[PDB]
Design a protein around this nucleic acid. Structure first.
Ligand SMILES: [Mg+2]
Ligand SMILES: [Mg+2]
Ligand SMILES: [Mg+2]
Ligand SMILES: [Mg+2]
Ligand SMILES: [Mg+2]
Ligand SMILES: [Mg+2]
Ligand SMILES: [Mg+2]
Ligand SMILES: [Mg+2]
Ligand SMILES: [Mg+2]
Ligand SMILES: [Mg+2]
Ligand SMILES: [Mg+2]
Ligand SMILES: [Mg+2]
Ligand SMILES: [Mg+2]
Ligand SMILES: [Mg+2]
Ligand SMILES: [Mg+2]
Ligand SMILES: [Mg+2]
Ligand SMILES: [Mg+2]
Ligand SMILES: [Mg+2]
Ligand SMILES: [Mg+2]
Ligand SMILES: [Mg+2]
Ligand SMILES: [Mg+2]
Ligand SMILES: [Mg+2]
Ligand SMILES: [Mg+2]
Ligand SMILES: [Mg+2]
Ligand SMILES: [Mg+2]
Ligand SMILES: [Mg+2]
Lengths: 203, 147, 102, 52, 210
RNA sequence: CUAACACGUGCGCGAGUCGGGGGCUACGAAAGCCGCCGUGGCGCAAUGAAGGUGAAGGCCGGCGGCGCGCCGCCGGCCGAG
RNA sequence: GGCGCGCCGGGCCCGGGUCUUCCCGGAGUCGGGUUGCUUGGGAAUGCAGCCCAAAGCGGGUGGUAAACUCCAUCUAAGGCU
RNA sequence: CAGUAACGGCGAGUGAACAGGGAAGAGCCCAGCGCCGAAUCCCCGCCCCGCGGCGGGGCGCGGGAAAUGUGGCGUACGGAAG
């Protein structure tokens, strides 16, 4: 099948063929606006890996997030307090640019539901991402029993609770000995279970 | 019961059992265990020696189940098995020694403290002291290992 | 002598007859398939090589293997991936030498 | 606060001691009248009635 | 300000703990709610075992507990395929399966296979349609004598084999157990460097001969 | 007032002890019961940084070992200052 | 409303064992360097920015950095419950 | 487990997990590799039924989606075909 060939093709990003393609697509996507609808994926294999099926109701946006860290949004210097919290410009944000790219399109289309997202191009000052979305009130998915799970009202705005593949990876979430501080639902549920007194009746 | 407590006798007494010269102020010596090396050094060295400083090797992912090896002494060795076995061992003219599995009772290691009564045994354990196994040899009896 | 099973020692542990089960099917993930090899070498002849990989080939041609190892280790990370990339580049230079000699 | 220690736990053996003492004192005639039950016409106060 | 003598101690009440406190005054409310839910489930699965499916003999890991035997997650599918029970039909007829468990041994596998066969001898499978019976099915007069059992199905006992009082052989009274333990400790501790020094002595003898 | 600790007192049991978590059967959200629910806590063992080790002995007979009259190893006896 | 039965109509014509031959995996992602935050996680537990950026008897984990060397263990970079 | 391993001007303070006992208990689905004449889906028009959770069937040389891949089998417990 062609998808194994184009998967191994997109794996060789340092090659001259894919380097030419990445810089041409990056030129075009940098010229074009910030959040516009792509008509069809640039990565048809990767979209199928992440969940996209070419049927009526799945909508692909490519959006650019402005690349870089996160300096502290504070007047001039003047973060008032102890010299621990005097950091301004070398601070880094807890979530990733791909998750920010998911939630910007998920907020721009509040009717639709962000399924997942992937990488298309980058330069020194932008990252581009194709976030793929699902129209949850279309009858080509509300009559399909293996994708009507997203039409349920529980999964409203997965991108902003951080339930996607790139929104998940900043929660410290997983099995192991590496992820002791998130057992329970989250690193807040872990903290909340640990910092309570179970004052019983009898004691 | 507040009916029995001290504050019922300290009504009318204008300092409530804390003094007029030195009033009951809030935290006169610092909160908690404060001032270990500075102004309570006399207390922490007359009553808690060794409290300050590091000693010994740091062992990071310690698991208290790897080092599980509970001990039993020989004077309570016969308390593992019911009385009928040792009575029949005292009555047996064959020389059939009773078999005692200490791991079944829940002690991995046998140490030898007390006097052990003079009738044979087959003591099977997971570890042995030097003195314990030779007390078992001195009563005349075998030390079977088990993993 | 007596050889009781002991909790400590060279052959420590309780004696249990180990059965021979066929391995689980998750364990073969990454064992190279003929079709996958035929895809990957074709993709390499379509694309070519990375710039650091061709510069490491340029180091291996002039037989300075040690700084080529250090270069590949600095570019890819671990020393195991460094030696694996070294032996694959040595194989592609061995193929290029025999192809230019034949 | 609500987390005042409202409850008390008692050992099982002296919970049993207590009801044994209550039952055993419910058989003495002086210890029932001093509790207050007007009893003086009862046939016998460890009083067993028919199973019917 | 510590007094004369006592433990110097670390109470973890420096945080704001009164906001996050769990009072347990709904303890008997949950101990009524759980048994109401349990009675409702035991009425809902009407002849089926009230505890649930059957769960296998397992050994604990981790040296402290390996003498004991627990109930496990589910019967391993290696332990199913040699008992003759299909991996999908087991969970239908009431046999818990997990595919994650290996089988390092043979004694445990034979015990779980014997346990599955002893279970399969005891289940009373009702017909899937009550009028017409089928082949994989129990007899009609056994259907009236079915009832829910309480507690775990075939409860796991931790049974010990008692040895009889042997006569001590002279071969057993020469077993120096402490010195044997200590010699085993030293051999297991030193086994690598013995072989390394044997290796270097071998190639230095090659150096002296060649 | 809650929690931890220390000591003194009263109560039950006692080398054990405790169901506090779970379960089974108006007052009662109580009370009873479990024991192949003692898992577990504390205690019954200490010491060492650690590998670790881990809490009386005595007597008899035989075999300058001789220029252990002192036992290496066994059979018997007394036995825990 | 639920568990109960009968009828019409519609979907589906469905399984197991043995042998032979084939086939099998998620990439600017893992990982590495550095910086900042966080963690009990200590020669770096997790998260993120930038730079380098893979492999397929491969990759991760095996709580002290690293090289050789066997073992054990799961199968990431997709999704529901 | 445990106020433990550990962290901390190793000062004050901070501080989990594995194991065991319980409550509950349930597992699964794609992309890929493939094979089946796109075998798949949406909408409008007419007829029959029901229609206050717009659905079931029949007819459309009626319109689109989709080969830049929909459906059926199939997913690491292996799987497909003969
Ligand atoms: Mg500060
Ligand atoms: Mg979820
Ligand atoms: Mg990551
Ligand atoms: Mg006065
Ligand atoms: Mg006073
Ligand atoms: Mg005054
Ligand atoms: Mg004062
Ligand atoms: Mg004064
Ligand atoms: Mg005060
Ligand atoms: Mg000073
Ligand atoms: Mg004072
Ligand atoms: Mg005091
Ligand atoms: Mg006292
Ligand atoms: Mg403790
Ligand atoms: Mg911060
Ligand atoms: Mg933060
Ligand atoms: Mg911090
Ligand atoms: Mg190590
Ligand atoms: Mg996966
Ligand atoms: Mg997953
Ligand atoms: Mg200091
Ligand atoms: Mg903190
Ligand atoms: Mg656990
Ligand atoms: Mg249960
Ligand atoms: Mg499917
Ligand atoms: Mg397909």
């Amino acid at each position: 099948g062609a998808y194994k060939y184009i998967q191994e093709l997109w794996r060789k990003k340092q090659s001259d063929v894919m380097r030419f393609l990445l810089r041409v697509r990056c030129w075009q996507y940098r010229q074009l606006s910030a959040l516009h609808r792509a008509p069809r994926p640039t990565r048809p294999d990767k979209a199928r890996r992440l969940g996209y099926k070419a049927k009526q109701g799945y909508v692909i946006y490519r959006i650019r997030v402005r690349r870089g860290g996160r300096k502290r949004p504070v007047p001039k210097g003047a973060t008032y307090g102890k010299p621990v919290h005097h950091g301004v410009n070398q601070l880094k944000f807890a979530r990733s640019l791909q998750s920010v790219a998911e939630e910007r399109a998920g907020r721009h289309c509040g009717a639709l539901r962000v399924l997942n997202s992937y990488w298309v191009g980058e330069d020194s000052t932008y990252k581009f991402f194709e976030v793929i979305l699902i129209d949850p009130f279309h009858k080509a998915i509300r009559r399909n029993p293996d994708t009507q799970w997203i039409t349920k009202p529980v999964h409203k705005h997965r991108e902003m609770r951080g339930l996607t593949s790139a929104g998940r990876k900043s929660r410290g979430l997983g099995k192991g000995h590496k992820f002791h501080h998130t057992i329970g639902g989250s690193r807040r549920a872990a903290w909340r279970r640990r910092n309570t007194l179970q004052l019983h009746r009898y004691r | 019961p507040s009916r029995l407590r001290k504050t019922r006798k300290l009504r009318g007494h204008v300092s409530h059992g804390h003094g007029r010269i030195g009033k009951h102020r809030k935290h006169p010596g610092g909160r908690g265990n404060a001032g270990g090396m500075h102004h309570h050094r006399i207390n922490f060295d007359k009553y808690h020696p060794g409290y300050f400083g590091k000693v010994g090797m740091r062992h990071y992912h310690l698991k208290r189940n790897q080092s599980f090896c509970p001990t039993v002494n020989l004077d309570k060795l016969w308390t593992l098995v019911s009385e009928q076995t040792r009575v029949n061992a005292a009555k047996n003219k064959t020389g059939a020694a009773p078999i005692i599995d200490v791991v079944r009772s829940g002690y991995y290691k046998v140490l030898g403290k007390g006097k052990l009564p003079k009738q044979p045994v087959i003591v099977k354990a997971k570890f042995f002291s030097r003195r314990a196994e030779e007390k078992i040899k001195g009563v005349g009896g075998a030390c079977v290992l088990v993993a | 002598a007596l050889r009781y099973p002991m909790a400590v020692g060279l052959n420590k542990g309780h004696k249990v007859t180990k059965n021979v089960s066929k391995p689980r099917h998750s364990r073969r993930r990454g064992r190279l398939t003929k079709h996958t090899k035929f895809v990957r070498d074709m993709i390499r002849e379509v694309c070519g090589f990375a710039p650091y990989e061709r510069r490491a080939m340029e180091l291996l041609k002039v037989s300075k293997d040690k700084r080529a190892l250090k270069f590949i280790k600095k570019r890819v990370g671990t020393h195991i991936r460094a030696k694996r990339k070294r032996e694959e580049l040595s194989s592609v230079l061995a193929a290029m030498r025999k192809a230019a000699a034949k | 606060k609500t987390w005042r220690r409202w409850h008390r736990r008692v050992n099982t053996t002296q919970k049993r001691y207590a009801i044994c003492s209550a039952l055993a004192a419910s058989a003495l005639p002086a210890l029932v009248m001093s509790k207050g039950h007007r009893i003086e016409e009862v046939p016998e106060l460890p009083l067993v009635v028919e199973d019917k | 300000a510590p007094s004369r003598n006592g433990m110097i101690l670390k109470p973890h009440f420096h945080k704001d703990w009164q906001r996050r406190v769990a009072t347990w005054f709904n303890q008997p409310a949950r101990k009524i709610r759980r048994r109401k839910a349990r009675q409702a489930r035991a009425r809902r699965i009407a002849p089926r075992p009230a505890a649930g499916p059957i769960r296998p003999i397992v050994r604990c890991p981790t040296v402290r507990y390996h003498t004991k035997v627990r109930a496990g997650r589910g019967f391993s599918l290696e332990e199913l395929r040699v008992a003759g029970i299909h991996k999908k039909v087991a969970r239908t007829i009431g046999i818990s399966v997990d595919p994650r468990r290996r089988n390092k041994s043979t004694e445990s596998l034979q015990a779980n296979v014997q346990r599955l066969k002893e279970y399969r001898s005891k289940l009373v499978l009702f017909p899937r349609k009550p009028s017409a019976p089928k082949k994989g099915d129990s007899s009609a007069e056994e259907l009236k004598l079915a009832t829910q059992l309480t507690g775990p199905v075939m409860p796991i006992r931790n049974v010990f084999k008692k040895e009889k009082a042997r006569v001590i052989t002279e071969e057993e009274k020469n077993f120096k157990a402490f010195a044997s333990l200590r010699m085993a400790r030293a051999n297991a501790r030193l086994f690598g460097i013995r072989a390394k020094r044997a290796k270097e002595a071998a190639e230095q003898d090659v150096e002296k001969k060649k």
